[PDB]
Amino acid sequence: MLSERMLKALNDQLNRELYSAYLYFAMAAYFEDLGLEGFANWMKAQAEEEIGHALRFYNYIYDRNGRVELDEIPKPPKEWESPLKAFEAAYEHEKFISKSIYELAALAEEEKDYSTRAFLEWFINEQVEEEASVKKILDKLKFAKDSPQILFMLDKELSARAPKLPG
Amino acid sequence: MLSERMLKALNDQLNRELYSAYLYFAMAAYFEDLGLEGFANWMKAQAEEEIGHALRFYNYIYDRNGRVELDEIPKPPKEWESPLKAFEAAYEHEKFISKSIYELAALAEEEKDYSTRAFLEWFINEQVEEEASVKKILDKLKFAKDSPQILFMLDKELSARAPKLPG
Amino acid sequence: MLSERMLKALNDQLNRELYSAYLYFAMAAYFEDLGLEGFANWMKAQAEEEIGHALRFYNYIYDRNGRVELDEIPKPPKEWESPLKAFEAAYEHEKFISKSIYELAALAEEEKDYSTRAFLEWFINEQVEEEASVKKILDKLKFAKDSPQILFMLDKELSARAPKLPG
Amino acid sequence: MLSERMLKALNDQLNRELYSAYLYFAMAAYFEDLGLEGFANWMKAQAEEEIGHALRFYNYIYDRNGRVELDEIPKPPKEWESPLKAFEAAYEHEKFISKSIYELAALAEEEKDYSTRAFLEWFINEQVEEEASVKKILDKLKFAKDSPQILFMLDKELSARAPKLPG
Amino acid sequence: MLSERMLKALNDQLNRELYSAYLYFAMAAYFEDLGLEGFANWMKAQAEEEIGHALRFYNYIYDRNGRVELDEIPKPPKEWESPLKAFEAAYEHEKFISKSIYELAALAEEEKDYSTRAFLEWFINEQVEEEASVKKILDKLKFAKDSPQILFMLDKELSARAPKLPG
Amino acid sequence: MLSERMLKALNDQLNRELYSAYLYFAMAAYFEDLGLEGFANWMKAQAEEEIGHALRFYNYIYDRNGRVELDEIPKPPKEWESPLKAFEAAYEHEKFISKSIYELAALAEEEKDYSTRAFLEWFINEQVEEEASVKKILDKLKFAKDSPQILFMLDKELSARAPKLPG
Amino acid sequence: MLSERMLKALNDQLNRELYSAYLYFAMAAYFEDLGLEGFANWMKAQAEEEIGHALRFYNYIYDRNGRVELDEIPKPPKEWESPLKAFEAAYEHEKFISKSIYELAALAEEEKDYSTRAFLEWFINEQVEEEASVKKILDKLKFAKDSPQILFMLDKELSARAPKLPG
Ligand SMILES: [Fe+3]
Ligand SMILES: [Fe+3]
Ligand SMILES: [Fe+3]
Ligand SMILES: [Fe+3]
Ligand SMILES: [Fe+3]
Ligand SMILES: [Fe+3]
Ligand SMILES: [Fe+3]
């Protein structure tokens, strides 16, 4: 039902999703420390969305009667030069996740694993939204090159998005 | 308003909370693998609860004009010899967390950090509920020693506690 | 718009779906004779669900301007050694249906029939559920090797699932 | 409480009913092919009803402590010369089922099996409607000899009868 | 994230979608002139639906950090010999659109562009609906060979489909 | 009911309306590319509004028992030096349409075509608003010369106008 | 306010509207006699509509400080060769009335009577509707030619339009 090769790669992705959660929580802390509460809440909601991605892997592995196994989660970076650089890193990160999803799709394909392929489909479309939504902001941060005024109003727009777990 | 030492001690506890989250997620995976859906969801909800605890620390630290630093989150155990042993490990852990809170409390009292010591009061009370609820279950597992039928019934009781994030 | 090979593979899968319906109906009559009314009703619900799958194929065929042909539905087994065994049979049957679908997928790909390959995703994803769902009960019936107490409790669980049609 | 001969004559009539469901499902495919969706849905509704008849025999058999035995369901005709021919075939089929019912009634009378003979009244009455309903359509079809405009309208009329199961 | 070759194919398709819109508009004008207001409204709604498909291409292209470019929209045909012929052209046109979708799927597979390939899935499925939809009416038009009475009626049914925009 | 000249002239105006829709759509793509969602959505709404105007000629033409003919729609411009230059073009376009309505009015008068001239009143009054609304924005853009803070605020206002179609 | 010529021209048009009412009332009796109640009620409704037109001339005359004068209302035709011929007459009459309104418009323009020319705008716009609905029906009657089944169906449609007075 799941080859050893595929199970290990899905567990590997599960771990990648969790480190993604961790990495955005890291950016949340970096944004609080700049006093940008909107930016930080956005990143906290990103963090939660990634845990959701991890749970989708967890559920899928169990549906295929496999076994989840958790690995260490590396310490993430502490700091970035500017909000723009933080979003450059988030975007570098989004692309690295897309890539790792494509690799998994190739692998399900190479192994003729239809089910796992169909499951990955949801992440292919989801990664389109992720990259786009981070790009939208990275670009706004460029267009606010030297303007604390726009930065301030950006921070306000990003506060629409809120972590659900405090509830 | 925070000494290096207190900030260090606090960012330290934040990480244990996260590791705590991570450890109960690992037991979720363990119980899910035995096909104990109730126990599994109970453990996912325990993990959310611990993410909560991490967030309180994060909030306190920024409240006191501190900086959160995130650290790596070690690999948890994959496996326990039985449901009972997982709960033994659970209880041992809670006790390990309580001890960590007392040490922090005691550190606060020593530095005369009334704010931090007051912050911690919440965790002293929470831990009481934590330990009590792990132990209740632990004891029930003993009482079901050689009874799949009781374990079956325990599993069903526990399915009442569901993690909130999926929704 | 359908090739002769496609049309054949599609009617075949339509007829396999109809035979699953009958197989599960056969299991319902088995479970009924054992007094296990919960089990028998669960199986009649699974029956109706399989007729649903057959109507899915039926519709796609007409959508692609093809012609449905109905073949004879073989006589299903009558007896099984035990509930556990009946579910093992059921599991293996679902795994057999899954592979029929992979095979249709593989045919679609060879022929470069994008429409059909695309229509099957739904079936690929449904089978992941179908197999999990059967496997969950299967596993519970093993955990209840020799104890009528549990089998009895399971029956009441499964009676939640009822066939919609009799109304 | 059921004689070996009776049980068998009951399990046979159950099968006849399923074959009926299949036959009308075949006529549905035929009408669907001609693009007569109203005739097609009418015939799917009839199929369902026939499955309903089967379940009544199934329920009776288990009340009298008998055992249900499913037999192979033969291949039904694929094609008919015309919509009218189909309904003539359907009328011929209902007359055949009615005869079947009578033969069961006589048998239960002869064996002085009151329960079974009582159970069958439902079918004796039901068959009156069935025949009458088919006859109504069959005649309407004769009346519409070489007139697609009439065929069209009849199709729109019969579309009032939707099968219940797709929902 | 989009190859120059891939972007041209996407903008090309966006243009075919828009031309499809215009084509049905041209057909709406054709039916309007015959005084068949039902057909004409149906075709306006068909048109509106194609503008939708165009927007989907537009959003995807932006989502991938590409750049839409709009090309001329060729003059559609003015007239057809008959409603039936018009529907034959719509059908033929539908088939032309699917081929172009398949060619893009192929292109995207050949480039290893999973995101675009995933984005196209939606159009593959939708084309199966489009085609079937047009076919269903085309065949009724065949069945209405030399019967204005039947034309008059389909007109009335089709009028249940109203373009959303006038309101 | 319509002279050949009037009919030709109404159809040409119909196609001018369509081209405006396409030109405003071109403008939407330009703003979208700049990452100015508010302006982009404004242009798409503007585009639908022009399809509306096209529909009014279409409707009037048929009311007078004429025939619509759809002509090609030329490729619009792709780029503009800036949001300002784009609104300037838009303003210039709007004046071009106004001038066209006047020639139509003037043509309807000289031919003593009261109905058409009456029909065009709506457009004279409409065109007064159309011009006025584009100018307001064009002037807010001068006001903003070298101030992204204002373009940003401007984008956000404009974002209140949304295309109805996607819904 | 009103030249003697204007007032006479208006009173004349008032009597023309009343005559039209009467004309449609004759057609009503003609269709009634044919046993086409739908057509007849449609004509009764059209008759009332014309009385409504007469009233707008009446009110306008008294708002301009003039005096209505009722002239006789000539005997309408009793009979037409066919439903199609009646509608050809209605259409001819609608054209006749449109001509009168244009003639009145011009006269107002001649006399530089801005108030009257402006008041006639309503009737210019109204006649467009009148002619169009009279045409839309006339065409179907042609399209029906040698088919009483369509006449029957047409008659059912027109029953939807009912005169208000009998209430
Ligand atoms: Fe993710
Ligand atoms: Fe905790
Ligand atoms: Fe199935
Ligand atoms: Fe029956
Ligand atoms: Fe399309
Ligand atoms: Fe316009
Ligand atoms: Fe009038």
CA gap D139, C41 in Å, rounded = 41
Q: Are C91 and C132 in contact (CB under 8 A)?
A: no
CA gap F86, G164 in Å, rounded = 55
Which residue type, as a one-letter code, is found at position D63?
A: D
Ligand 5: distance of its center to the CA of F22 in Å?
18
Ligand 6: distance of its center to the CA of E51 in Å?
19
Task: List residues bridging with C73 in a β-sheet.
Answer: D73
Gap from A73 CA to chain B (nearest CA, Å)? 5
Nearest to B39 by CA among B167, B151, B164: B151
Cα dist from A83 to A39, A79, A80, F164, whole Å: 9, 10, 7, 35
Ligand nearest the Cα atom of residue G14? 7
Residues of G in contact with F115 (CB under 8 A): 98, 124-125, 127-128
What would the two tokens of residue E37 be? 């207001």
Residues of D in contact with E136 (CB under 8 A): 35
| H/E element, E34 | none
Cα dist from F116 to F107, G98, G124, whole Å: 9, 13, 9
Alpha helices by DSSP H, listed for chain F, are 4-34, 37-63, 83-110, 114-142, 148-158
Distance of CA D128 to the CA centre of its chain: 12
Q: Are D34 and D152 in contact (CB under 8 A)?
A: no
CA gap F87, F134 in Å, rounded = 7
CA gap A45, D2 in Å, rounded = 67
What would the two tokens of residue F108 be? 């309807």
Residue that is written with structure tokens 């060769």 in the block: G81
- B52: three-class secondary structure by DSSP: helix
Tell me how the structure was determined: X-ray
Residues of C in contact with B149 (CB under 8 A): 147, 149-150, 153
For chain E, the chains sharing at least 3 beta-carbon pairs closer than 8 angstroms are: A, C, D, F, G
In this structure, the number of other CB atoms found within 10 A of the CB of residue B81 comes to: 9
CA gap B19, C55 in Å, rounded = 50
Longest dimension (CA), chain D: 56
CA gap D153, D44 in Å, rounded = 19
Residues of D in contact with E143 (CB under 8 A): 35, 148, 152
**Rg for chain F (alpha carbons), in Å?**
17
E strands, D38-123, in order: none
Q: Do chains B and F touch (3 or more CB pairs under 8 A)?
A: no
Contact E112 A102 (CB under 8 A): yes
Cα dist from B28 to A58, A68, C133, D122, whole Å: 10, 10, 19, 55
Query: By the CB < 8 Å criterion, does F140 face chain G?
Result: no
CA gap D24, D138 in Å, rounded = 14
Q: Are B38 and B154 in contact (CB under 8 A)?
A: yes
Q: Are A111 and A3 in contact (CB under 8 A)?
A: yes
Q: Are C82 and C30 in contact (CB under 8 A)?
A: no
Ligand nearest the Cα atom of residue F55? 6
Nearest to C58 by CA among C119, C131, C128: C119
Nearest to A125 by CA among E56, D166, B116, F150: E56
SS3 content of chain B, % helix, strand, coil (to 5): 75, 0, 25
CA gap C73, D51 in Å, rounded = 15
End-to-end CA separation in angstroms for chain E: 39
Question: What single string gives the DSSP state of each residue in D7-54?
Answer: HHHHHHHHHHHHHHHHHHHHHHHHHHHTT-HHHHHHHHHHHHHHHHHH
* CA angle in degrees (0–180, nearest 5) for B20-A54-E120: 170
Query: By the CB < 8 Å criterion, does A67 face chain C?
Result: no
Domains annotated for chain C, with CATH where assigned, are 1-167 (1.20.1260.10)
- G45: three-class secondary structure by DSSP: helix
Residues of F in contact with G127 (CB under 8 A): 115
Cα dist from C23 to C68, C73, C79, G86, whole Å: 22, 10, 11, 69
Question: What single string gives the DSSP state of each residue in A60-115?
Answer: HHHHTT-------BPPPP---SSHHHHHHHHHHHHHHHHHHHHHHHHHHHHTT-HH
Residue that is written with structure tokens 């001649």 in the block: G110
Query: By the CB < 8 Å criterion, does C140 face chain A?
Result: no
| F33 CB-near residues (< 8 Å, 6+ apart) | E62, E67, E68
Resolution in A: 2.8
Gap from D35 CA to chain E (nearest CA, Å)? 7
Q: Are B54 and B17 in contact (CB under 8 A)?
A: yes
| G97 CB-near residues (< 8 Å, 6+ apart) | G16, G17, G20, G127, G130
Q: Is C79 exposed, middle or buried (0-12, 13-18, 19+ CB in 10 A)?
A: exposed
Task: List residues bridging with E73 in a β-sheet.
Answer: F73
Q: Dihedral sign, CA of B120, B125, B128, B133? A: negative
Residue that is written with structure tokens 């420390």 in the block: A33
What would the two tokens of residue G99 be? 């001509």
Q: Are B45 and B162 in contact (CB under 8 A)?
A: yes
Nearest to A23 by CA among A47, A2, A59, A4: A47
Distance of CA C37 to the CA centre of its chain: 20
Is D79 assigned a ligand-binding role in the annotation? no
**Which 8-state DSSP code applies to residue A158?**
G
Query: By the CB < 8 Å criterion, does A64 face chain C?
Result: yes
CA gap A24, B95 in Å, rounded = 30
What would the two tokens of residue F130 be? 């159309």
